[PDB]
Design a protein around this ligand. Structure first.
Ligand SMILES: [Cl-]
Length: 156
């Protein structure tokens, strides 16, 4: 297991950007990768993943910014489809902090129904620093309220 990978359940991890020399290892350990960096941040083409038999969702998010709630939910749905096929999924930004941490917190709230508080404490335990900006934090409250609101519809 790639030591940079920070697992938030048995199948999904977040990390920093693998370097090109790290790709063979990351590919032996993961079947799918959600790449959250922008093109100019990458030091190799995303074909390198394809060549190694790894499925890619490229969901670029400019650094120190936040996805919208709809980008987040799109990423979550794709992660869920792969987990269902028996895959392991790595989510990665550049530093392993704000962007990939924001998605990882979103993954715990969606898949396990934990509060933003409990999810954020789990992600920070694995990587202190994660979720960097207040826009990142805001989108997570936005998502939390939507999750509560959707769970409330199902009760009544
Ligand atoms: Cl919704």
């Amino acid at each position: 297991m790639w030591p940079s990978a920070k697992f938030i359940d048995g199948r999904v991890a977040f990390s920093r950007m693998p370097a090109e020399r790290e790709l063979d290892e990351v590919a032996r350990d993961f079947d799918a990768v959600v790449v959250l960096v922008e093109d100019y941040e990458l030091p190799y083409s995303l074909d390198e993943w394809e060549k190694r038999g790894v499925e890619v969702l490229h969901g670029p998010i400019p650094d120190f910014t936040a996805p919208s709630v709809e980008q987040l939910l799109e990423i979550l749905r794709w992660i869920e489809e792969r987990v269902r096929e028996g895959k392991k999924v790595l989510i990665h930004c550049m530093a392993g902090l704000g962007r990939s941490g924001t998605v990882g917190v979103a993954w715990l709230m969606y898949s396990r129904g934990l509060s933003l508080r409990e999810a954020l404490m789990e992600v920070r335990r694995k990587r202190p620093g994660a979720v960097e900006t207040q826009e990142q934090m805001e989108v997570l409250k936005e998502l939390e309220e939507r999750i509560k609101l959707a769970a409330a519809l199902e009760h009544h």
